[PDB]
Amino acid sequence: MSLVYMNIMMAFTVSLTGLLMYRSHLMSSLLCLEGMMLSLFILATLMILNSHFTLASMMPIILLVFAACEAALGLSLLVMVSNTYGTDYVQNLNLLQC
Amino acid sequence: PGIVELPSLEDLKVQEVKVSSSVLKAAAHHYGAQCDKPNKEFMLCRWEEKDPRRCLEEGKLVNQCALEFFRQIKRHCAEPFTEYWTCIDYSGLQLFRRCRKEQAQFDKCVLDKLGWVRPDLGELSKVTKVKTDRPLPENPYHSRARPEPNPEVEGDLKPARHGSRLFFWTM
Amino acid sequence: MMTGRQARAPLQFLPDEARSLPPPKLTDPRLAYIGFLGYCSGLIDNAIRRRPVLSAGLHRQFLYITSFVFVGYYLLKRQDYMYAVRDHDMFSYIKSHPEDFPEKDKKTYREVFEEFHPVR
Amino acid sequence: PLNYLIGGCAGGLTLGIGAAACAYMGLTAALVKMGQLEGWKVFAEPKV
Amino acid sequence: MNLMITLLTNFTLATLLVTIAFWLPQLNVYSEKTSPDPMGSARLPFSMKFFLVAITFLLFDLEIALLLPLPWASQTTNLNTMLTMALLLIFLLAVSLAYEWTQKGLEWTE
Amino acid sequence: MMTYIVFILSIIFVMGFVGFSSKPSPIYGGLGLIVSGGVGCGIVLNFGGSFLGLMVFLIYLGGMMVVFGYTTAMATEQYPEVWVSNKVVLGTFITGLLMEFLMVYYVLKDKEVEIVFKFNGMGDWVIYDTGDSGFFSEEAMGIAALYSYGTWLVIVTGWSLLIGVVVIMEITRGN
Amino acid sequence: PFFDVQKKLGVDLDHWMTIQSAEQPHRIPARCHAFEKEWIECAHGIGSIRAEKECKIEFEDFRECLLRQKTMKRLNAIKRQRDKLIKEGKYTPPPHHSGQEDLRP
Amino acid sequence: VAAFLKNVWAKEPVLVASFAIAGLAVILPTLSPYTKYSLMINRATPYNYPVPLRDDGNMPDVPSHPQDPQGPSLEWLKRL
Amino acid sequence: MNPIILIIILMTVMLGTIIVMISTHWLLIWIGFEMNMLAIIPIMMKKHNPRATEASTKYFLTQSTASMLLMMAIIINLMFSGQWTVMKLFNPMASMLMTMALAMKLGMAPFHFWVPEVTQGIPLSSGLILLTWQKLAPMSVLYQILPSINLDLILTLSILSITIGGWGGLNQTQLRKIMAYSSIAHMGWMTAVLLYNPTMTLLNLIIYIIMTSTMFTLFMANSTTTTLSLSHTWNKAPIMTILVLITLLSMGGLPPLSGFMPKWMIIQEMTKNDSIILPTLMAITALLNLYFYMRLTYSTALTMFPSTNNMKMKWQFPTTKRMTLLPTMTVLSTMLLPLTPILSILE
Amino acid sequence: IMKDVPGWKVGESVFHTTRWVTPMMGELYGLRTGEEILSSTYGFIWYT
Amino acid sequence: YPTKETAHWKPPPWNDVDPPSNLTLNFGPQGVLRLVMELSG
């Protein structure tokens, strides 16, 4: 397929596997998730600009708005977790084992 | 598939309007007034044929009528036009509003020596009509035959023969 | 399956060609069973709130029965409509494609040979 | 069918449950050869 | 290209002034100083209110991102629709501010 | 080299995602995602989507990664590092960035031009300026038609942002 | 369940951003306006199952307009043969490919 | 309605100015005699080429030249 | 929570699902999922304990990853089709990623690892919303993209869902985890028949929602969250002792109850398509679900009865809980098998 | 150029239609120098 | 059914809530006054 799109998808999959491999923090998970959003923005933008398709120019702005509202929701969840425990560690989030 | 058919380099030779963009923009309204008919024949041919290869002779007529326009400027009103496009050419955005006295002198000499009235605000953006002697392109997209649609339903709606027929449900 | 049929007239619960069909009678055994479901919902509604089950809330049990019969009448009308559409589409498709639905030759049993398997 | 019925049972004896997988692995391996015989599709293509 | 050349010039001047301002006083052999705060050593206290003003910033900033194509939106042929949606976006930003008011959200950093 | 600037910025973009995705800390991860957002914004700006790249800088890096860094600073308690005199505290920084940019150069090796020169992207890559648009940006007018054409999109987006304000004020109150 | 409320109520909520050949601001066409219009007018109303095999040619033309894989492959073939004929030496570039001839308009 | 208004203009004049300006911005363009001219100026701004029509023989309103009398007028815009 | 804010947020949940259902554009699908997730998060944090915050965090992470994979599927569709119509997809990569994203949204296995934890952490009403209303939007998208869905992928996810939702319910005493593994098994049953007859998918979805809402309404009406606390119901409210358990005999799928209707119609429509091994093995695993849920039925209307003394004080108070539609849902979840050919209304 | 390569047709359209397709950047400036390609494909984007 | 790895799981609480400071600043002399504050935000 097309050349720069392979790079943007590869960036998406690297940030996916970063989200799919937790090390320590919930903030690193939100970072990998929003890197996924960034790569989606770049890829949608490059397609819509390449196609000269006019009415989808407003699409990546809406992607950015909805997913940054999503990220605000994730930061508030992380803050409530960190006020419960003291740290935002993912191993403090394991009370639902039983 | 098939060989794409291109015109020869002798089909593409025409005398070029070798002037700059400010020179074109300075005579723009008089060009739209005076060279109206071959320009509009060409743009009708261009939005109807949808192909630059079927429009070459009308484009040559456009280039010819543009050259005759600028020769007719050159024979009569060379110095007011040069004074006007120099002042148009100084500007970065090439403003008309910075150059009203040179515009007035150019329009004065052109209306005196040639009788060309500069078009009013609104005229050059009108949709005009063009009389042509070429046929209308019956398939400009070169679409092949369309697939035959699925047959619709017709006839009245009789009830279900012995109901739902779901294993033992008699209705 | 039949989603391409009701796409040209979307979100019609009962189309205008449903009215060529006879409606279910009010003595329909399916509708009588739905009224029985309304009566059972009324009885459970008195039972779960600790009321005398056959006595309390006759207005309430009667609205239960009436509501289930009222919904189930239009449900049975749509059911009859969709099976009528199924059979109409089937018969028009058999009539339109004869080469895929040939009449198979029914041979009498004097020519039809079956292998006999004795039980002994 | 009997060929994989032996080889699945011997797979149970090298599994670790010894004669339990003999009635399980060989009975699953028997279905594979019978499926290859009579064309049995578990992931069947939608037709109707 | 001229933009990127100017950005590279500004970055190189900034890094050069940072490099000079770090390396020029280190040529001094001044002294090796021994043993180089209001709280003693305790943890950073989390403040819920600073986080709330950061999120309120982010949400009104997304609403501003919706508001940005309005000088281009004024040029349209469907002006009644455009004016209605512009007033509706600024009204929803105002309704967000009013809800942020009336739930004591803008308090002690009002 | 200068023709291939979009491909080069994409390679920098993938390397920056490898940078923060290995997750040394959320603060260095945030720094790597800021750098990656800047170079991916450069990818967008080198097609001619200038409003969309400025939306990246103004909104993504300008609000959202600000709030990410702001929230990250209110957790993950800081601790010092090496601070020996200016060879160690800045010369190691310069050598580390020199190794990083030499890695950016070193991933563009003969195993890479086998993918590049076989499937040559430049020559025909950015076809955005193919012919004339006119006295407008197509990208700007498509974004501007959010108000005339995109009525339902404005309604659902503004309602989701109002609901986002309400939702954050509910789940952060803790009551 | 696709509850087609937009076609039931006669409102347009999102059909306008759906395709490239729709009504665009200032009548800007997409790069593949004609190819998508031909694919849509081929595949209209006949169903997807007939459309995948009866309108395959219009769809291959439209996908090759979108992605230009055959065109990039042909250009890479011509340019790599040109590189081979330069390095072997049996070809020399003309003045209009070295920038020496003061272009047409 | 007049005691409350003076009370809120005494307490909170910032919000009174805000609601008054926003109310004027809402209900004022519906009352203006120049709102139609914004529409008429925006639809008279020629971003595209005025693609001409094939003259079939009966179009007495479509002109043949810009300086022909028939066609849309912008004399209202030069005069105002 | 302020009840006006609760009503506005529940209308935003419903509005997000309706936006997924009615829209023809993929961006509006993605918007409807974003709105649905954003709005359902405060319903989970309604009580503000650490378990609900942990459950909301895990739910946010899984649904957010699924939304990103959904948008990547949409973007690959725009590559290979240049358009945005919600219909079939034009790349097996986009079809695979969208099937994975919708399977993550449904909690189908192997993306099932959030559903028992999140259902455990949140209250019973929000668990009801998560196991009934949140299933509707991804099943609608799977209904509309079924010309593109890979058969082997959806059948693998369906059998892995039915097997893991079966073997999850052995070791459980928490009722919400039991309903979550029942959810995983039933979503496997729904997506098994999707590429053969999606009307049977809609039948299984509607009957499952009725039975699930009956079970969660009974769990709210008895204030029971565990098996051990459900077993005190006979000394407190004896009519609840039979309704919970014959609804639970419906949920496994057992005639003459209406929960046998979906699995029987699925087996019926998959053997038209010459698949005989697959409905047999899926319904054997449904019998494994019956095995564990019948053990729970024994524990509640049989052996482990014993009571406490403060039941003597609960006897003097009737219920004031609005057991809304509970007789209607209990009659619909049990006595609807004679009305089985009503399923044509979903065609 | 394309003489030694067998089975080649010069000016072969990659489309199945005979409709005029608008030429891509590399169909026009493809065999040209890199300075013309720079001024063609990043000229307006990089202009000041 | 408790195996080895699940035998040390205590059951969750009945109401699903679990068993779960303020800043102190020393404004030193750096008129001269030392203030030991107790802040609450």
Ligand SMILES: CCCCCCCCCCCCCCCCCC(=O)OC[C@H](COP(=O)([O-])OC[C@H](O)COP(=O)([O-])OC[C@H](COC(=O)CCCCCCCCCCCCCCCCC)OC(=O)CCCCCCCCCCCCCCCCC)OC(=O)CCCCCCCCCCCCCCCCC
């Ligand atoms: C001149 C103008 C006025 C004319 C008026 C004429 C009538 C005057 C009287 C007005 C009232 C009419 C009532 C309906 C007509 C009779 C329907 C009938 O018998 O159908 C025979 C029907 C088929 O027999 P057939 O000889 O082929 O047809 C004779 C007629 O042509 C039947 O006609 P068809 O072949 O066209 O029927 C269509 C189709 C025929 O059926 C079929 O195609 C076969 C499939 C039927 C469903 C099988 C499901 C099996 C799995 C689930 C089993 C559930 C558990 C069983 C019940 C547990 C206890 C609740 O029906 C269905 O599929 C509907 C589903 C079954 C409901 C039947 C009607 C019930 C109404 C009253 C319900 C009261 C509760 C009774 C218990 C609930 C269950 C019945 O028999 C059965 O399916 C066996 C069950 C017995 C039927 C219900 C008997 C109704 C009277 C009950 C009195 C005792 C109540 C005691 C208290 C409550 C229970 C504890």
Ligand SMILES: CCCCCCCCCCCCCCCCCC(=O)OC[C@H](COP(=O)(O)OCCN)OC(=O)CCCCCCCCCCCCCCCCC
């Ligand atoms: C219709 C057009 C669009 C209207 C909406 C958009 C307006 C643009 C500006 C947006 C403002 C957003 C925030 C508004 C919040 C209002 C509620 C509020 O602030 O209540 C508290 C306040 C008292 O202040 P307090 O709580 O004490 O604050 C500490 C400092 N003293 O109480 C107050 O100050 C009372 C505020 C309400 C009363 C103001 C009345 C002004 C009337 C002007 C004339 C009418 C104008 C036409 C519009 C209709 C107004 C009703």
Ligand SMILES: CCCCCCCCCCCCCCCCCC(=O)OC[C@H](COP(=O)(O)OCCN)OC(=O)CCCCCCCCCCCCCCCCC
């Ligand atoms: C193809 C299909 C297309 C779609 C068709 C329609 C689909 C319907 C899907 C139904 C999904 C139900 C979701 C849950 C109910 C939503 C409303 C709600 O939030 O109810 C819970 C509410 C919470 O109140 P709260 O204050 O939290 O109480 C806790 C104690 N303080 O109140 C309570 O807790 C009160 C206790 C009783 C709650 C009973 C709720 C029953 C709702 C389901 C009814 C049955 C489904 C409809 C019929 C079948 C439709 C398929």
